[PDB]
Design an enzyme around this catalytic site. Sequence first.
Site, short mmCIF file in Angstrom:
data_model
loop_
_atom_site.label_atom_id
_atom_site.label_comp_id
_atom_site.label_asym_id
_atom_site.label_seq_id
_atom_site.Cartn_x
_atom_site.Cartn_y
_atom_site.Cartn_z
N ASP A 177 0.86 -1.18 0.00
CA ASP A 177 0.00 0.00 0.00
C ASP A 177 0.90 1.24 0.00
O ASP A 177 0.64 2.22 -0.70
CB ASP A 177 -0.88 -0.01 1.26
CG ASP A 177 -2.35 0.32 0.97
OD1 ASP A 177 -2.76 0.31 -0.21
OD2 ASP A 177 -3.09 0.56 1.95
N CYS A 211 0.73 0.83 -14.28
CA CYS A 211 0.34 0.81 -12.87
C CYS A 211 -0.75 1.88 -12.87
O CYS A 211 -1.76 1.70 -13.58
CB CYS A 211 1.50 1.16 -11.94
SG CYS A 211 2.78 2.19 -12.68
N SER A 212 -0.59 2.97 -12.13
CA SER A 212 -1.63 4.00 -12.20
C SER A 212 -1.18 5.00 -13.29
O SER A 212 -1.90 5.24 -14.26
CB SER A 212 -1.83 4.68 -10.84
OG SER A 212 -3.11 5.30 -10.78
N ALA A 213 0.03 5.53 -13.15
CA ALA A 213 0.59 6.46 -14.14
C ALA A 213 1.51 5.68 -15.09
O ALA A 213 1.93 6.19 -16.14
CB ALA A 213 1.38 7.58 -13.44
N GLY A 214 1.84 4.45 -14.71
CA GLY A 214 2.72 3.62 -15.51
C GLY A 214 4.15 4.14 -15.54
O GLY A 214 4.76 4.20 -16.61
N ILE A 215 4.71 4.49 -14.37
CA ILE A 215 6.09 4.99 -14.32
C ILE A 215 6.87 4.54 -13.10
O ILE A 215 8.05 4.23 -13.19
CB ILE A 215 6.17 6.54 -14.37
CG1 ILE A 215 5.54 7.16 -13.12
CG2 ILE A 215 5.49 7.07 -15.62
CD1 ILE A 215 5.57 8.66 -13.12
N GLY A 216 6.21 4.49 -11.94
CA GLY A 216 6.90 4.07 -10.73
C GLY A 216 7.22 2.60 -10.77
O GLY A 216 8.36 2.21 -11.01
N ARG A 217 6.19 1.78 -10.57
CA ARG A 217 6.34 0.32 -10.58
C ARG A 217 6.63 -0.22 -11.98
O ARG A 217 7.41 -1.16 -12.14
CB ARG A 217 5.10 -0.33 -9.99
CG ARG A 217 4.75 0.26 -8.65
CD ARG A 217 3.85 -0.65 -7.88
NE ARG A 217 2.44 -0.47 -8.18
CZ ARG A 217 1.52 -0.18 -7.27
NH1 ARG A 217 1.85 -0.02 -5.99
NH2 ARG A 217 0.26 -0.08 -7.63
N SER A 218 5.99 0.37 -12.99
CA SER A 218 6.22 -0.01 -14.38
C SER A 218 7.70 0.21 -14.68
O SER A 218 8.36 -0.64 -15.26
CB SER A 218 5.39 0.87 -15.31
OG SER A 218 4.06 0.98 -14.85
N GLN A 258 9.69 6.54 -9.08
CA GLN A 258 9.38 7.83 -8.48
C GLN A 258 9.83 8.11 -7.07
O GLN A 258 9.61 9.20 -6.55
CB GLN A 258 7.90 8.16 -8.66
CG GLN A 258 7.53 8.41 -10.13
CD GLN A 258 8.27 9.60 -10.78
OE1 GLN A 258 7.63 10.47 -11.37
NE2 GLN A 258 9.60 9.60 -10.75
#
EC number: 3.1.3.48
Length: 278
Positions: A177, A211-218, A258
């Site tokens: 989370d 992911c949500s924005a597709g940058i952190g986890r992606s 991020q």
Amino acid sequence: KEFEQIDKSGSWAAIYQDIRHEASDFPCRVAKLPKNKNRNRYRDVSPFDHSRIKLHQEDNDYINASLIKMEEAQRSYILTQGPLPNTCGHFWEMVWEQKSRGVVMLNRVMEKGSLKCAQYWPQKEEKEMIFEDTNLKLTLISEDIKSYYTVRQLELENLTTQETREILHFHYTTWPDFGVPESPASFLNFLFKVRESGSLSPEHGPVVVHCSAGIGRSGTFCLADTCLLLMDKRKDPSSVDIKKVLLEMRKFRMGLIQTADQLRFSYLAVIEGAKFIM
């Protein structure tokens, strides 16, 4: 060594600070166009014009997605935001046009009591989805729910030509989370599952990751993958520099990774995945 030193000196935030500073900055004119305001999930996450994926529609070719071509590793990825209620048809148009095989979701539709993404795929195989606008149908063929992830075998049919394609949906369902995962074991094991399917192989279009924005986890997924692939080609982990690879990917899309927290994790995953690889 390097990982251990940064940990000892606690310079992670600083390291990440300088990476953010070194990061490439390129135009996003199209994204910023008013007619595309509703095609974007977040204000601060946009596809550079030079690398954005264009939809093959004479109408409006905008979809918040970027192609990341990693020449050395010979691997491409398409990073994207979780599709919006009004862009699930675009998402699938893109998937079809780019001839993608896999789709990598590194988020849950609802995290922290908020909807971070749309239910763009069917949950019950007896009720398929039809994206009117892009004239595409989508059907759940099967799914395998496991402890940390779920694989779904979907079938995407081009209603225009009645052509049918088998898309695989790899859904990572256990990312914390807050913070990053306590251990890379599951993530790497999930990466490997993605790899095994051929979804990342050259015989297919680039894998759509989000992911949500597709940058952190992606970003993390792609970084861990590429670095590991590079350690294979050169077979020399000594030349594969995480920071240099990250900056290379950041020329293609903003915000990959991020938080310095995530950066440390990418180091963990790569280092841990290199064990089997080496």
